[PDB]
Amino acid sequence: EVQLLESGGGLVQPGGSLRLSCAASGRISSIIHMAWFRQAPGKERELVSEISRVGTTVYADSVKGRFTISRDNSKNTLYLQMNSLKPEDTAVYYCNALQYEKHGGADYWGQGTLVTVSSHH
């Protein structure tokens, strides 16, 4: 198993910024794809960004240019810098890790960290 511990969310105004963190531990594969997903009311779970060990990245079209995925490997930590936040970015954000186990792929989940972007909290 890989345990994923998220932090960094909270309340912010439109145009604001937040940085999420995801600390990984456990039996982490040499080939591991790390991702941020989000779940909002009225929408399906959505991939936000992903990074491979060599640093290739992908972004959802709706966050391109505004969000940046990053790492501090000395802490086994994945980050998501969110800039220029919009109300439609409100969601629970999850850390995810995708690697093989003996029987097949495993998609490990963090707990989630809530991000609420609003002018009228």
mmCIF file of C-alpha atoms in Angstrom:
data_model
loop_
_atom_site.group_PDB
_atom_site.id
_atom_site.type_symbol
_atom_site.label_atom_id
_atom_site.label_comp_id
_atom_site.label_asym_id
_atom_site.label_seq_id
_atom_site.Cartn_x
_atom_site.Cartn_y
_atom_site.Cartn_z
ATOM 1 C CA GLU A 1 0.000 0.000 0.000
ATOM 2 C CA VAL A 2 0.840 3.644 -0.535
ATOM 3 C CA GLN A 3 -0.590 6.097 2.007
ATOM 4 C CA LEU A 4 -1.214 9.630 0.755
ATOM 5 C CA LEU A 5 -1.710 12.501 3.230
ATOM 6 C CA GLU A 6 -3.051 15.777 1.881
ATOM 7 C CA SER A 7 -2.872 19.278 3.294
ATOM 8 C CA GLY A 8 -3.109 22.841 2.109
ATOM 9 C CA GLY A 9 -6.756 23.475 1.271
ATOM 10 C CA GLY A 10 -9.116 26.019 2.761
ATOM 11 C CA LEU A 11 -11.117 29.123 1.869
ATOM 12 C CA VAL A 12 -9.905 31.704 -0.673
ATOM 13 C CA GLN A 13 -11.325 34.531 -2.763
ATOM 14 C CA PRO A 14 -11.529 34.488 -6.576
ATOM 15 C CA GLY A 15 -8.218 35.445 -8.063
ATOM 16 C CA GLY A 16 -6.427 33.979 -5.031
ATOM 17 C CA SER A 17 -3.895 31.209 -4.740
ATOM 18 C CA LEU A 18 -3.327 28.107 -2.635
ATOM 19 C CA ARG A 19 -0.704 25.357 -2.612
ATOM 20 C CA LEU A 20 -1.785 21.813 -1.854
ATOM 21 C CA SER A 21 0.592 19.157 -0.560
ATOM 22 C CA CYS A 22 0.474 15.390 -0.633
ATOM 23 C CA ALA A 23 2.939 13.370 1.421
ATOM 24 C CA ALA A 24 3.425 9.756 0.266
ATOM 25 C CA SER A 25 4.680 6.778 2.244
ATOM 26 C CA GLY A 26 4.582 3.013 2.163
ATOM 27 C CA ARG A 27 5.697 0.654 -0.609
ATOM 28 C CA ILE A 28 6.186 3.123 -3.431
ATOM 29 C CA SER A 29 7.129 1.727 -6.826
ATOM 30 C CA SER A 30 10.007 2.927 -8.934
ATOM 31 C CA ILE A 31 7.387 3.591 -11.664
ATOM 32 C CA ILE A 32 4.613 5.651 -10.083
ATOM 33 C CA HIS A 33 2.316 8.262 -11.584
ATOM 34 C CA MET A 34 1.115 10.902 -9.165
ATOM 35 C CA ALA A 35 -1.990 12.963 -9.779
ATOM 36 C CA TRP A 36 -4.369 15.520 -8.365
ATOM 37 C CA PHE A 37 -8.072 14.922 -8.933
ATOM 38 C CA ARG A 38 -11.081 16.936 -7.770
ATOM 39 C CA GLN A 39 -14.729 16.196 -6.958
ATOM 40 C CA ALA A 40 -17.299 18.993 -6.886
ATOM 41 C CA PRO A 41 -21.101 18.881 -6.461
ATOM 42 C CA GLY A 42 -22.858 18.346 -9.734
ATOM 43 C CA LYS A 43 -19.786 17.090 -11.604
ATOM 44 C CA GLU A 44 -17.858 13.884 -12.131
ATOM 45 C CA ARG A 45 -14.488 13.289 -10.504
ATOM 46 C CA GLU A 46 -11.962 15.097 -12.728
ATOM 47 C CA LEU A 47 -8.234 14.731 -13.315
ATOM 48 C CA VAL A 48 -6.548 18.063 -12.578
ATOM 49 C CA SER A 49 -2.842 17.352 -13.145
ATOM 50 C CA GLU A 50 -0.382 14.457 -13.203
ATOM 51 C CA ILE A 51 3.394 13.948 -13.113
ATOM 52 C CA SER A 52 5.618 10.971 -13.809
ATOM 53 C CA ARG A 53 8.881 10.263 -11.990
ATOM 54 C CA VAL A 54 10.955 11.852 -14.762
ATOM 55 C CA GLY A 55 8.758 14.950 -14.582
ATOM 56 C CA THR A 56 6.426 14.700 -17.586
ATOM 57 C CA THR A 57 3.217 16.557 -16.775
ATOM 58 C CA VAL A 58 -0.368 16.725 -17.986
ATOM 59 C CA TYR A 59 -3.063 19.225 -17.081
ATOM 60 C CA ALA A 60 -6.838 19.381 -17.513
ATOM 61 C CA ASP A 61 -7.700 21.912 -20.202
ATOM 62 C CA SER A 62 -9.614 24.053 -17.711
ATOM 63 C CA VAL A 63 -6.535 24.590 -15.447
ATOM 64 C CA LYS A 64 -3.791 24.960 -18.067
ATOM 65 C CA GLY A 65 -1.723 28.009 -17.390
ATOM 66 C CA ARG A 66 -3.162 28.539 -13.885
ATOM 67 C CA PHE A 67 -2.085 25.419 -11.966
ATOM 68 C CA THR A 68 1.397 23.872 -11.666
ATOM 69 C CA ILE A 69 2.187 20.436 -10.233
ATOM 70 C CA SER A 70 5.508 20.076 -8.410
ATOM 71 C CA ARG A 71 7.437 18.006 -5.858
ATOM 72 C CA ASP A 72 9.847 17.998 -2.933
ATOM 73 C CA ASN A 73 11.341 14.489 -3.124
ATOM 74 C CA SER A 74 13.272 14.985 0.119
ATOM 75 C CA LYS A 75 9.838 14.808 1.824
ATOM 76 C CA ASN A 76 8.262 12.354 -0.682
ATOM 77 C CA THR A 77 5.789 15.161 -1.346
ATOM 78 C CA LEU A 78 3.710 16.189 -4.333
ATOM 79 C CA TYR A 79 2.466 19.783 -4.610
ATOM 80 C CA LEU A 80 -0.225 21.590 -6.601
ATOM 81 C CA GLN A 81 0.219 25.333 -6.920
ATOM 82 C CA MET A 82 -3.149 26.868 -7.797
ATOM 83 C CA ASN A 83 -3.136 30.417 -9.086
ATOM 84 C CA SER A 84 -5.929 32.636 -10.458
ATOM 85 C CA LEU A 85 -8.547 30.554 -8.659
ATOM 86 C CA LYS A 86 -12.133 30.710 -9.922
ATOM 87 C CA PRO A 87 -15.441 29.744 -8.226
ATOM 88 C CA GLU A 88 -15.687 26.697 -10.464
ATOM 89 C CA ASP A 89 -12.437 25.392 -8.933
ATOM 90 C CA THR A 90 -14.332 24.727 -5.689
ATOM 91 C CA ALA A 91 -14.087 21.024 -4.896
ATOM 92 C CA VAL A 92 -12.502 18.438 -2.677
ATOM 93 C CA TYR A 93 -9.058 17.849 -4.135
ATOM 94 C CA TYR A 94 -7.492 14.384 -3.849
ATOM 95 C CA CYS A 95 -3.894 13.116 -4.212
ATOM 96 C CA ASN A 96 -3.739 9.852 -6.238
ATOM 97 C CA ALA A 97 -0.946 7.424 -6.998
ATOM 98 C CA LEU A 98 -1.037 4.842 -9.776
ATOM 99 C CA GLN A 99 1.316 1.898 -9.790
ATOM 100 C CA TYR A 100 1.199 -1.805 -10.429
ATOM 101 C CA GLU A 101 0.732 -4.390 -7.721
ATOM 102 C CA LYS A 102 1.064 -8.133 -8.317
ATOM 103 C CA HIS A 103 -2.523 -8.579 -9.568
ATOM 104 C CA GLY A 104 -2.855 -5.365 -11.553
ATOM 105 C CA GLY A 105 -2.967 -1.648 -11.273
ATOM 106 C CA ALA A 106 -3.737 0.120 -8.007
ATOM 107 C CA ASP A 107 -5.012 3.692 -7.719
ATOM 108 C CA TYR A 108 -4.221 4.837 -4.180
ATOM 109 C CA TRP A 109 -6.235 7.777 -2.800
ATOM 110 C CA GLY A 110 -5.550 10.476 -0.283
ATOM 111 C CA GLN A 111 -8.285 11.621 2.045
ATOM 112 C CA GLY A 112 -9.022 14.887 0.267
ATOM 113 C CA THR A 113 -8.566 18.560 1.132
ATOM 114 C CA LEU A 114 -11.453 20.971 0.610
ATOM 115 C CA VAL A 115 -10.917 24.093 -1.493
ATOM 116 C CA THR A 116 -13.665 26.685 -1.546
ATOM 117 C CA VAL A 117 -13.318 29.712 -3.825
ATOM 118 C CA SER A 118 -15.992 32.321 -3.120
ATOM 119 C CA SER A 119 -16.556 36.067 -2.954
ATOM 120 C CA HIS A 120 -19.435 35.494 -0.477
ATOM 121 C CA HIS A 121 -18.255 32.986 2.138
#
